[PDB]
């Protein structure tokens, strides 16, 4: 009964899609790509909004364009057909405080400058020196303020910590949940806003046999018969046999495997269960929750000075006073515990003014955990969403020379037509955005256990399974290429 | 006759004396060729009593700079102001285009940042695979990334990124690519009187130790147990240990012919190969300074850091687009003079915003430096040479063209126009006791070598100190300061532990 297959890939995200592509390109046939959703792409998904406008609600950028192999590949194509597949949209950040207004490039505040000194401080804090304890990003910032208070103005002490939190939008984590050791990292060059990551997804998906793709099939278990064979079971009853399998489900979905209860959507029952090294790696790495909100307006009636805008959370002069009077990190903690609801100003938010970079009168906004989890939970209540983001949307329009926003969801004033929201934390085949470090996490344990496979036949691919480009679309891509190559060679020696 | 002999009263030599004294060492003296202390640290006085550091000006790497932290503690204790954090957002000016900084369409700072990453990736974990000139490195980048750069970015980015010339005091075709990018361990603090630092240390040991105008010309280390030193005037001192702090450039004369060169010291026996071979790894740049003193501030204090970019050409762009490789671009870059204020980048510190003084402190680099210090006394010519960039700057700062008021001919209808009252220029390249600014790398150079050679010393008795004898803070005031405490400590114990 079990139909024979050379290789069976679980998940049609970019890792799985590139693993299949690699296999076909290497002359391997009789393979399959099992995907639980009714589409390919995984965390790469482009959606349609007001008037046919398109937005990437998952990944949006090609990072590290200096080294990024996926980007380079895409750039080569565009060098021939002259087609526009991406656009370099890095720009000078505009920072907005609710009270003070724009604080970027300010001749008195000089925030970007002290931020740079802070990064250096963090680097001098962990780089080189072995054995330093980890601690949260927030605690790292307080330590910086404490040690350098003699060289900072009251305004810098107040607004710097809030401006530094834009890093929260790189991890999808609040600074008190984020590992200080993982916060900073060098970007290998400018980023490139993909103009349809779906275009990248379809190009790869289409580079191999289409009857290889099986959508809407949710894998529920994988068994290794200690006799060169692997049994896979789709929920739709079908059973398969294969020499090899490449598992590319999110680290969060795979986690479900090391816990009791098998009736969880997306969970895969492994027999034998995943090795202890893999099991144990889950206690040393976690998952962040970066989310997106697409604010679509009728037309562009605001300044297009920049395509990057960050709204700072609220700060107070009281905080400055506490920093001035604290004797040590211990007292600052005590004094800081000063005693109410969560508003659009309770945390930083990162806005992408697509008007300037793509010409579309819309804003792409990034949010972090825990806000992401609350906002996605009420993803349906548009009225409530507008109320929540109304004050910061207004403050932006002010700073960008415009009037308060008008709710046109059902000539001189910005009219909001639609609001789109990500759903990654509530989606069972997602359960979050991507791998992230809580203080104490060592991503290396997971990368090592994943790339060494459960055994010779059961392998892993995905953004959480590799070092360079970890968490990125291109890293997931490379991992796909990594596992398919190892298998092509092995089979090649058949 | 003496226990320790310190040659040079720069900050390296003065710290070394301060230390020895701090460890109760007796009978030590400081021999300085000049008629003052401070070496490359010199604060001069100009119009209306304004003071300027014509040598070192900033405390670099304030996060780790131990000299700076010491000054900071002093300030915490007495409230006296010893420095100010003058880092600021740079204003970049092009003769034709005007301001090109923080531009919504040019975004030069962002690509310059990428430019920096690329440089790290090229020399990263490769053992520094064959260095080239900063200029060459920049061309590689332009070529390899042209597909992702606009025409104007290709034109102005190379010019803007040359601000790095003012950090080395070397033009981009003479500068080592591998050493072009530095750490910058935190903000910089402008010393509000480095003379305060020099004075403090000079006053921390026996005032009778110092001997000014004493040019040392020969250091003889007899296989016995004492060293012999003789100033040019004839006086000969002999001591247990000797800490030589003269600048690398001067020390590099000991390995040349003709002991008639001013400053050159004759070693007996000669400097071992290791040391002499160290000088083969280039070194010594020529950062220079010009101070423009105005009657009063009549320009906008938008920033305290202004950089005028050297002229560029669209013709250059066209060539980057065409070249098919590094060799074709290299040769396709053949344009067949005259040096003007626009032939190189110039760095202007607008002291009005940071220190409330109506002056500009301008930094220049080799080969321009030597030419400008050559005519330092020709005020009229100095004015004509920089007049165009000065006006270009004043225009951008919402002011008028400069008026020459250096002579006793003041006017009354010039209250809205900036009035230049005086110009002050350095003389480091032409001063025999400095012969340049400080250690620097020509492509192919390797500082580690001279550092180890100097650090190791000629022997347990003939030691070295100075901004070229250390790794952390190399070429900086604090590096020289530390190197001084270093040799001091060693010699200290070798004497304290004895009897
Ligand atoms: C909001 C957001 C923004 C992001 N922005 C960026 C960015 O700007 N740049 C960047 O580089 N990265 C970004 N990322 C990360 C990037 O999207 C991911 O690294 C990458 O898409 C992960 O790819 P993958 O192939 O490993 O996994 P997917 O996460 O691609 O997983 C593969 C597939 O497994 C399927 N699957 C799960 N369970 C089962 C099952 N039981 N049976 C069958 N199939 C199953 C899933 O449905 C999924 O399609 C972002 C992520 C999010 C969530
Ligand atoms: C234009 C300029 C700008 C600078 N800006 C900065 C800055 O912003 N920040 C910073 O950290 N550094 C700066 N520096 C560098 C800083 O000035 C030096 O690192 C430091 O002063 C070197 O100190 P030193 O003690 O090693 O040498 P000096 O160079 O201090 O040398 C010591 C002494 O040796 C004496 N000497 C030489 N030959 C003989 C001889 N034969 N006999 C007796 N005595 C002799 C000299 O006259 C001199 O006084 C700058 C330098 C220049 C030229």
CA distance B253 to A135: 54
Q: How far is CA A156 from CA A94, A316, B84, B124, B478, in A?
A: 17, 12, 15, 35, 27
Instruction: Evaluate whether B451 touches B469 at the Cβ level (below 8 Å).
Output: yes
CATH number at residue A413: 3.90.660.10
> What phi and psi, each to the nearest 5 degrees, are found at residue A193?
-70, 110
The Cα A58–Cα A473 span in angstroms is 10
Both B392 and B257 in one domain: the answer is no
The token duo for A167 is: 């890093």
Triad A183, A188, A193: Cα angle to 5°: 95
CATH code for the domain in which residue A208 is found = 3.50.50.60
A321 and A266 co-located in one domain: no
One domain for residues B292 and B422: yes
In this structure, the strands spanning A229-234 and A239-247 are antiparallel
Closest residue in A to B72 (Cα–Cα): A150
> Of the candidates B142, B144, B124, which has an alpha carbon nearest to the alpha carbon of residue B134?
B142
Residue A58 CA to residue B127 CA, distance in Å, equals 40
Torsion on CA atoms B221, B222, B226, B232, rounded to nearest 10: -50
Q: Which of A428, A449, A470 is the last residue of a domain?
A: A428
Taking phi first (over 0 means left), then psi (-120 to 50 degrees means alpha), and beta for anything else, what does residue B436 get? Answer: left
The number of C-alpha atoms within 13 Å of B100 and in the hemisphere containing its C-beta is 28
Atom of ligand 1 nearest to the CA of A465: 26
**Residue B317 sits in the same domain as residue B413:** yes
Sheet holding A308-311, edge to edge: A101-102, A94-97, A308-311, A349-353, A362-367, A291-297, A415-421, A406-407
* Chain B nearest CA to A170, separation (Å): 18
Name the structure determination technique: X-ray
Long-range CB contacts (< 8 A, 24+ apart) of B379-385?
Answer: B379/B406, B379/B422, B379/B423, B382/B290, B382/B423, B382/B425, B383/B420, B383/B423, B385/B340, B385/B341
Say yes or no: A156 and A256 in one domain: no
Closest CA to B184 of B116, B136, B121, B284: B116
> A12 and A45 share a domain?
yes
The span from the CA of B123 to the CA of A59, in Å, is: 31
Among candidates B444, B490, B452, B482, which has minimal Cα distance to B61? B482
Give the residue numbers in A contacting B (CB under 8 Å), as ranges. Answer: 65-67, 75, 79, 88, 90-92, 105, 107, 110, 112-114, 117, 120-121, 124, 148, 150-151, 186-190, 192, 305-306
Q: Please, are residues B420 and B403 in contact by the beta-carbon 8 Å criterion? A: yes
Size of interface A-B (CB pairs under 8 A): 71
| Integer Cα distance of A103 and A114 in angstroms | 13
| Helices assigned H by DSSP within B28-81 | 66-78
Domains contained in chain A, number: 2
Q: Are residues B129 and B181 in the same domain?
A: yes
- Domain identity same for B333 and B295: yes
Overall resolution, Å: 2.4
Interface probe for A, chosen from B110, B113, B114, B122 (most Cβ of A below 10 Å), is B114
**Spatial separation of the C-alpha atoms in residues A157 and A315, rounded to whole Å:** 10
Q: Is B208 exposed, middle or buried (0-12, 13-18, 19+ CB in 10 A)?
A: exposed
Q: CA-CA distance, A341 to A180, in Å (whole number)? A: 27
Q: What are residue B285's phi and psi, to 5 degrees?
A: -100, -175
Instruction: Give the helix ranges, DSSP H, for A99-246.
Output: 111-126, 137-148, 154-164, 168-171, 180-183, 197-205
A238 and A352 in a common domain: no
Domain with B298 in it = 85-188+283-432
**Bond before A107 cis per omega within 30 degrees:** no
Domain boundary among B402, B432, B462: B432
Residues B338 and B400 in one domain: yes
The rounded Å distance from CA A256 to ligand 1 centre is: 16
Q: How far apart are CA A192 and CA A64, in angstroms?
A: 9
Q: Which parts of A23-106 are beta strand (E)?
A: 31-34, 46-48, 54-56, 61-62, 86-87, 94-97, 101-102
Of A399, A428, A457, the residue at which a domain comes to its end is: A428
Nearest-Å Rg of the Cα atoms of chain B is 24
Task: Write b or e for each residue in B151-170: b if 16 or more Cβ atoms lie within 10 A of its Cβ, otherwise e.
Answer: ebbbbbbbbbbbbbbbbbbb
Q: Are residues A128 and A176 in the same domain?
A: yes
- Does residue B457 sit in the same domain as residue B339? no
Torsion of CA B27, B33, B34, B36, to 10 degrees: -10
The C-alpha of B188 sits at a distance from chain A's nearest C-alpha, in angstroms, of 10
Write out the H or E segment, with its range, that includes residue A5: strand A3-10
Give the Å distance between the CA of A183 and the centre of ligand 1. Answer: 21
């Amino acid at each position: 009964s079990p139909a024979k297959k050379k290789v069976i890939i679980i998940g049609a995200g970019i890792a799985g899609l590139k693993a299949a592509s690699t296999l076909h390109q290497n002359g391997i046939q009789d393979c399959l790509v099992l995907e639980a959703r009714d589409r390919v792409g995984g965390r790469l998904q482009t959606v349609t909004g007001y008037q046919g406008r398109k937005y990437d609600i998952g990944a949006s950028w090609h990072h590290d364009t200096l080294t990024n192999p996926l980007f380079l590949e895409e750039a080569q194509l565009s060098l021939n057909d002259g087609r526009t597949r991406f656009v370099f949209d890095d720009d000078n950040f505009i920072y907005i405080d609710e009270e003070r207004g724009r604080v970027d490039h300010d001749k008195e505040l000089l925030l970007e400058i002290v931020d740079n000194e802070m990064s250096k401080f963090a680097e001098l804090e962990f780089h080189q020196h072995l054995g330093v304890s980890d601690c949260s990003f927030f605690q790292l910032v307080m330590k910086y303020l404490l040690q350098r208070r003699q060289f900072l103005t009251n305004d810098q002490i107040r607004y710097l910590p809030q401006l530094c939190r834009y890093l929260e939008l790189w991890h999808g984590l609040d600074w008190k949940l984020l590992s200080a050791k993982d916060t900073y990292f060098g970007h290998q060059g400018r980023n490139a806003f993909a103009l349809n990551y779906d275009s990248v997804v379809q190009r790869i998906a289409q580079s191999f046999p289409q009857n290889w793709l099986k959508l809407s099939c949710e894998v529920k278990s994988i068994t290794r018969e200690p006799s060169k064979n692997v049994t896979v079971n789709c929920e739709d009853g079908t059973v398969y046999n294969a020499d090899y399998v490449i598992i590319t489900v999110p680290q969060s979905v795979l986690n479900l495997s090391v816990q009791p209860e098998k009736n969880l959507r997306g969970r895969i029952e492994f027999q034998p269960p995943l090795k202890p090294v893999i099991q144990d790696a889950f206690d040393k790495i976690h998952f962040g929750a970066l989310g997106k909100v697409i604010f679509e307006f009728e037309e562009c009636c605001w300044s297009n000075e920049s395509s990057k805008i960050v709204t700072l959370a609220n700060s107070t002069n009281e905080f400055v006073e506490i920093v001035r009077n604290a004797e040590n990190l211990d007292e600052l903690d005590s004094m800081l515990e000063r005693e109410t609801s969560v508003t659009c100003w309770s945390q930083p938010l990162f806005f992408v003014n697509l008007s300037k970079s793509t010409g579309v009168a819309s804003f792409m906004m990034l949010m972090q955990a825990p806000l992401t989890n609350h906002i996605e939970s009420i993803r349906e209540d548009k009225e409530r969403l507008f109320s929540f983001f109304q004050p910061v949307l207004n403050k932006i329009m002010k700073c960008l020379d415009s009037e308060d926003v008008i709710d046109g969801m059902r000539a001189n004033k910005p009219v909001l037509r639609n609001i789109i929201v990500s759903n990654w934390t509530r989606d069972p085949y997602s359960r979050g955005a991507y791998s992230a470090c809580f203080p104490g996490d060592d991503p290396v344990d997971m990368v090592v256990a994943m790339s060494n496979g459960q055994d010779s036949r059961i392998r892993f691919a995905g953004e959480h399974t590799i070092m360079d480009g970890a968490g990125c679309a291109y890293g997931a891509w490379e991992s796909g290429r990594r596992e398919a190559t190892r298998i092509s060679d092995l089979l090649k020696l058949e």
